[PDB]
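ok so heres the complex, four chains, lmk if somethin looks off
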Amino acid sequence: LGLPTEAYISVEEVHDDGTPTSKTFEHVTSEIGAEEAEEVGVEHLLRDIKDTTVGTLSQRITNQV
Amino acid sequence: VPGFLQQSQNSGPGQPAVWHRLEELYTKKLWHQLTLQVLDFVQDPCFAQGDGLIKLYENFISEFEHRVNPLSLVEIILHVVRQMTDPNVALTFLEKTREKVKSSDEAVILCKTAIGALKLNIGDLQVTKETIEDVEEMLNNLPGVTSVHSRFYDLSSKYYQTIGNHASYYKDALRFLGCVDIKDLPVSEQQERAFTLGLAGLLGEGVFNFGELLMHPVLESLRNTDRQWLIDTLYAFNSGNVERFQTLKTAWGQQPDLAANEAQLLRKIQLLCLMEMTFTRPANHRQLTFEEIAKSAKITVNEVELLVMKALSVGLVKGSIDEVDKRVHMTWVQPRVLDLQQIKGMKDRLEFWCTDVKSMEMLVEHQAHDILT
Amino acid sequence: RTRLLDSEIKIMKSEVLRVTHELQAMKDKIK
Amino acid sequence: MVLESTMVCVDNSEYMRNGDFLPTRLQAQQDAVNIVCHSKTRSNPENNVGLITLANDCEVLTTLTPDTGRILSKLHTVQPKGKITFCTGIRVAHLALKHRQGKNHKMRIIAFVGSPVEDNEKDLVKLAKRLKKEKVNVDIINFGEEEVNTEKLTAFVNTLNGKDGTGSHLVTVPPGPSLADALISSPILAG
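and the predicted structre for the whole thing:
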């Protein structure tokens, strides 16, 4: 599910409701970078780049998670 | 100076002993004992103006001590104003000393907070309100002192004094709760401040958040000392909506403020009732008869045909409304907070439906296991 | 007076660090 | 050229602001660090000196280095205000000496106490017995002010150096103003 990296940024502020200190890490959106000739080491063994498995197993994964 | 502290400075009981100790600190050069213990004796208010007059002499001693201004100067100024009494030009002198000697920039922002408060006492919504804006710039984004933010809250509360803007009061009181160290605030003094917060402070149209501030624990416990029925009436306007019995009670709870804004508040509860149907009830019970809205707007059922349109007009939340029975069944709504313990969020609505989905997901797997491969 | 001399000595220590920084700046420039 | 690396712990606090020792206690503390770094340099050029405040924050002000230039810069603008937290700092200093790759260099800690420490005596004594197992010499020079008689520290030093141990000297602050040279002589005379 989701992605391996979790992004947190720690900031100091006054909570509007009034939590004391209000200093904590804040979650931020995270993404995967773009590289070339990187999965030749790994994906070459497997891979499934086709529309054949769309709606065959893709629906199962979404229902699964 | 050493002779002055030994005998003339003494006023309250134990003052000769503490001043003799202060002389030992002066010789020992222990600024920290002078910064905390000596200022702690100054903190005691029994001496009142007399300690403050002595404090001007002690301020010269403090200049030799060179104790950190954010701690030492602010405490000296807190009792310096008591010595000043009515400061027609005394305020300029204390501000001048604070400006001339600054251990840190943070102390300079503390000087600004004092300047604004003194200006507020002599003048209203003039340079002092602009100085309150200047203090926001001076504070910048640093809440580490926390007490400095409370001083910033004090001018923000002073801005509420300068212009009624009860919404500004609602923001400052919330800011005070965040920047207060804890419940270390004198409970009785805060309960007395909460008595005002329970009365004029929450009676002001500025705060009505269905318990976002009202159900916050520290203020409500202090507001318990304030009439409980008035405190209940404040919750009642937000979630009880029309609360006609509470409407009679609100006049009893606080005649000031409520009487002045009774028509405006009546309009606000009518808007609150319209928001209440959609967030509290999603579908089904969200749809309701025009007569219930007539009771909700405390208006006649024939009048509610006209009235629902006015409540709909505010359009605080975008939705779909059918006038067949004035049923809501609307779209987007923003609840200030969820009711109870978010019982709807548990198996009452959410979670239970999610459990049902995975069993159906298993049915998709059973339907086509070979295809999954 | 004596405190001013002590402040000058601290600045002199910073100047010794600055001579090392100048050598580092020269080394980066040399590359 | 005896090889030794010392993780000294400096103190920055409102107590350190007091200038009873020399013009300023912090300046005197900086002077004390200067002599020890010079003494280590005389003993061996490769000797590494590193220091950190033990008050409020106990990280690493400078990683241990043979050159003393970094040590001098860290002493500059030390900025004193944090309340002393000796227990966290002493634990950090001992492990930091192990952290250094060159463990062959002898491991020693010199610390300055400017304020009384609010810690259970048993808790510091338990750390001191662990320090004895680590077998790293620790000598503390109290500066300006300390818990009266440094009783907890005296027990801590005894636990650190018991059973005919190094018995590294613990210097309680001399009452009133103390010359930096007077403070430097006791560590030079014995650890």
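quick notes: Chain B has one domain: 1-330. thats all i got rn
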